[PDB]
């Protein structure tokens, strides 16, 4: 249980998060912790008070903390066309 909660209704798709690629199928030990599969890429974002080597990862209308030592940031810009 507990897997989501309704606000209010309002449709605004505004975030600014990261994306990297997992280059190993982690498996998270606590809820605060989100469970990794390889070779998929998913939200990554820094949180307050987070650590470095964690990110905030949201996967399966679930979010927590990732082990960037398993992401791999794709740095890398559009193709203006």
Request: proline share 2%; charged share 20%; hydrophobic share 30%.
């Given at each position: ?10 449709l ?10 997992v280059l190993?199928d ?23 008070g ?23 940031l794709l ?7």
């Amino acid at each position: 249980g507990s897997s989501g909660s309704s606000g209010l209704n309002d449709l605004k798709e505004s975030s600014n998060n990261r994306k990297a690629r997992v280059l190993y199928d982690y498996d998270a030990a606590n809820s605060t912790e989100l469970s990794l599969l390889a070779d998929e890429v998913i939200t990554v974002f820094s949180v307050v008070g987070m650590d470095s080597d964690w990110l905030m990862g949201e996967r399966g209308n679930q979010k927590g903390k990732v082990p960037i030592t398993y992401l791999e940031l794709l740095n890398s810009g559009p193709s203006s066309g």
